[model samples]
Target: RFLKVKNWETDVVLTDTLHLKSTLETGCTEHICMGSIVLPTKDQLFPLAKEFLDQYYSSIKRFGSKAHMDRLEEVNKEIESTSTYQLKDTELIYGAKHAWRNASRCVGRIQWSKLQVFDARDCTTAHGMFNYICNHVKYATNKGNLRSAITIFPQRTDGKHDFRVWNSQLIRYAGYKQPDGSTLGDPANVQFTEICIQQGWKAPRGRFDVLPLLLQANGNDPELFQIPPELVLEVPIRHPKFDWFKDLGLKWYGLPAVSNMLLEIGGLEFSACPFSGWYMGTEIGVRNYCDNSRYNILEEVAKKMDLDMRKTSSLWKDQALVEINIAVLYSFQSDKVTIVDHHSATESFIKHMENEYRCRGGCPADWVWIVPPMSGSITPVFHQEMLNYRLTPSFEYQPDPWNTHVW
Candidate 1:
């Protein structure tokens, strides 16, 4: 509800109350109590209210109890929890009352709109069809949850409104700070995943867009959780973020065989190619970097990239960039470029290699982190010099091409 105030002017009619009333006559389910959002005094009243309804039944929980019945009723009588979700200086754990009310508004409208089959609202109904018809036409389409509108305001930049928001959780934090008004306990520090991080949705064009957009815009900023009263209702699906590359360092290597050596970095896998264009850069200690040291020679392959990372340090902080250098030892017919899963890279074949050249007082010291470009790199050059190669074979280790689609 873009209500006009005496002095402050007016904005979009994103009234949570009106939406809330519409949803209450319907229903709300397991998004909050399932979320374990147990706190009090603020916008999160919906969750509290949900606890109320569940006092006798929280069927979704499977372990629902009748512990908080009266509490739910008390909150229902409180000033519409719908508006509370986005208030500044608000509570992190508002009760179920607000959640049920507001979420229902969003959910109920969604259900009604979709049920119409046709885009038009229910123009004809029994006596007093106005309510159903009016509600029907409202939430007609998936608004991308209105991400376009979230960033751009009703008018120009001169207007005082927040930018479009896509990522749901990021904004949720902004809408309501924790009960202590501290961080949301999301100790994220930019992770590196197999897939490069982009500012959009993983799902095609559904509800997930809100979060990616939010993270893209406000994520890097230092102070973003604080927000205005109008933006809090932007709730979407919730899930854990992935950081494969960061949590588990990604690797692609030349090898006799590929095997996963590390147990901790188990979930991720890497693509290895018998890359002929591979080369090695000389740092401080290691004498040999490339598979062969005869052809591609380097003067200073001893330089090391920044060596400042800890075991738990974010994976993003230590990403490695390198020059591919390939050569022939006896070329029995080497396998084409093959992908080596991260786990396989850790196997004795790969892990020991890293330890021998990188760890054993070579260019890379005892540090777990490694990077390229720190030392100017040079490939010794590839050569089928010793034509006696054989493709490295194993049912498990397949030559996973980086991209075969290209013509």
Candidate 2:
């Protein structure tokens, strides 16, 4: 529930840049609406993104004097040999960019934002993150779906500095939109999915019944790292700290943030993949312009529980996009490369998942979530449930005091 944005251009843009002075003067919310998120409602462009990525790889297979066909052949061989028959779910998001090279070895502007990583746990964070966003950051086109300009969308219009609620809180509940643009607010939408699926439910697309198309195949193959090299979700690394291959294995499939973004992996973890068109140049056997740019953000996330998220090293420069990649990161790096013990690996992973759940950090137990708890015309017909008090993770991850979650 948020639409209202006055002086949208100047005020919000400054907050996005973390301009506290301007924010104070204008009495504004300093939310930059992470450039990481895409413009809402771009579902129609997925085919274009997927196609461009595929063609970029094909060109890689036939570029100049050197061909990547050999690499592809080897990858295929590994996929054929490493026979995996089951898949597991994790929480992590990977993002990256890819360059478009023509037959003559030329490139062009970006066509898509790839969602190279999609960890379900990361997905949880994403759900909360986006809730704060949509409710707080009203787009030019989105005039409705808002209750106030402030971050607390579910609440009424309050003064900018009001401390009644936590700024990082997520939209509680939202519903399906009808042709008339109303919230269906169906109870079933909030129904808890069965255990193997989801123990709880909330809003938007909480615990969807299906698995990602690309990831579902994991149930049958190990060598099937069938993603394109240029558009990979996980980047390969040598540095122990940034090397997920050593300790916690990472994989990505589908859009970690949204369903439309496209990207490929460079390493074992899915979230480490790069987006398109960020590299100045490339080479065989190694990405000359390579790096990990998402480590610190991840490390921050890890504090909520225990994770070895770190940044990466390497380099990539793009003048037009005005971006650079020059860091390698990871929280933990192990020496033992492969998960040799399959049965034990699965058991260990599940155990880790259980451990993670033990510390709620103030997040709700089985509180699936419902961003906006109410949205458009489909309309919510709410009956009172019950008021409740809960503990939340305040600065459970922050440094000094860590950013604290509140009452």
Candidate 3:
């Protein structure tokens, strides 16, 4: 009954309607789809809280039991009296894991059940947030054997005293706009780097200078805290076959800790929850290293390989891309760091999807994001269709804290 969905990139129109039952509408009409909208309309707390309480009880196989009913009543009374309620420690732990399981963009949901959730709701100061984050980094890094973990700060209450981490990731290279109009370090972080400088961070202007943490507690201005150098674990990338790769001096942090996303449980919104996992090789190699707006090292690698880069037909870019991916995989393996290659990651994801279908009927996924950036056709996920939908206890994009700041 819906109009055909044309894949603008491939010009293929999907006419199948059987799978539509599992698909949730993203404000899409018969003529239009609003899937690009990042943040959806907010939900009311009381109703959502009730719904989540029910889910929690059901997960524990205690739905409608005396304890479950009493907990629900407790939440209702608290919300009615104070307009908000605190989650039980067990509830918070379960909710955090559920959020990871519901994350549609992540290919590593196979490891969702293993996430270490740190409840930092008691943290009330920016300095305390930094200490907690530092501890989180230490625990997750595990001396190069990375583990999946999340540290959740206080939930947003009244939207006035929200705690937030301003950095996109817990660890990121600083970017500096040079006097010659070129950028040093990560161009993706240029504006953020400038903001850090404005906030009194003395930039070293180095290519891979780790950025400081921007901690915002109780809606106050963000504070800058330097991560202890000893706590940071870095793996220098080198190719198994090419010794010249060592001369490139490329390195990346062991943890991919995303700090800016909002964590939602029931209707409660956590404004700052930094989550991290071990990286997939392509994330560092194909996207971070080879993307034009990123490191853009394909040409240099191609030159080193002595491949004819003048013609696309020579597949020089493809060759260099593969070698760089190999380098990332090899380096991570040699260092004994936990990293998965695209093939294994996607294959595991397929099994996860199957497990999900058997358990929950359907799994929400964005196909474009699920497919690897390179070698799309070679992956099993590229051949599969997916339904993207919102699921509760979810990690969602929130507005940048700086954008809404009074400063």
Candidate 4:
């Protein structure tokens, strides 16, 4: 707050020449590095730890104030000596909720408090990780009765140990790049599919084959495990008014369990936390199916709709985008699945912002993604400006496990 006030003061004088340089004379320009290993500094730690301990005291109030204060002292010492600390079940659950709530790009923050967190920190083997993943998929998938869930593994400390789930999502389509330069399924998985093949996992030649889970434990090669077909739920997409929409041979998994992000609580980083929430209608409709980089089905859909697709002003693409989204929402609901439409999703996000204001001053949001693709101006989130910033106890994107040193 004081920084904002400080920035409000402006100078109208001639600026002096700035000469900021690192002590290293390796001519490393932007950064000084020794053999691709950049040296660390102290500033990265103390501030992160301070914020983490502060959040811990706020969220873990189930323990008495005196108990929390005493434990904080003990944990502080443990963090210094062992380079790791622990959170109770109540604190972990609360941390998970706050992480979702603090996720800037998420439009589903309204359901943040409902996240079911599974702690698997003691798990130390690939099979143990696989068992936990099976449980997460089973519980979160809920036999098409979906619920939000997160499975957290151990944290990364001193770069000594690491664990990760290699798949982008626990459930996703296998994208096979054809010889004709076209993709046979979800195009995003082409690279991962190749990785699976290199690891001796055979993939079938189907447009909707579910990829197997790739779990990696510390100092061990990654293992591939096929999920039970009965346990994985899939929804066949069909339009409410257009029957031929189903004939397009489009289908998607029921759950979007993201397994490739790091879950950072305070200063601790949980590298193998896999989490899932139900998808928003537009995320599947406009993006996954209609995006140029993915399915690229707009022109085909336009032709099916018999729209005048020859001209840009005809808005055939927009029409096709909306129809695809409509089909997604209708199909999910028709299959007795829980999915939020873009219209209602943004409105609920406003409610989330209001709750955050009362509870935590202000919440950050990304307006570009927060607004629905089909109808932007119609939603309040489109008109509202959002501030984006990093917060503690939040989920963050990290490098793929295959590229990390542990791999």
Model 4 whole-model lDDT (C-alpha atoms) = 0.77
Clashes of each: 77, 81, 0, 0
Per-residue C-alpha lDDT of model 2 across residues 79-130, encoded as one tens digit per residue? 3455211112211121122211000011111121232222222222323434
User: What ranking of all candidate models by lDDT puts the best one first?
Assistant: 3, 4, 2, 1
Deviation from native of the Cα of residue 172 in model 3, angstroms: 0.4
| Sort order, TM-score high to low | 3, 4, 2, 1
* TM-score of every model versus the real structure: 0.15, 0.19, 0.92, 0.86
Residue lDDT tens for model 3, 199-302: 99998999999999999999898899999999989999898889999999999988999999999897899989999999998999998889899888998999
Identify the leading candidate in terms of lDDT: 3
In the range 22-108, model 1's lDDT, one tens digit per residue, is 222112244532222211134444553353345223323433344345434444555264332121111111111122112210111
lDDT of predicted model 3: 0.87
Extract clashing residue pairs from model 4. none
Best by TM-score: 3
Better of 1 and 3 by lDDT: 3
TM-score computed on alpha carbons, candidate 3: 0.92
What RMSD does each model have against the real structure? 28.9, 26.7, 4.0, 7.7
The C-alpha stretches of model 3 lying farther than 4 A from their native spots are 1-27, 34-43
The model with the greater lDDT, 1 or 2, is: 2
- Residues 114-231, model 4: lDDT tens digits: 8998999889999999999999989998877899999989877656578888898888888898889888888888999989889888898688889998888764688999998988
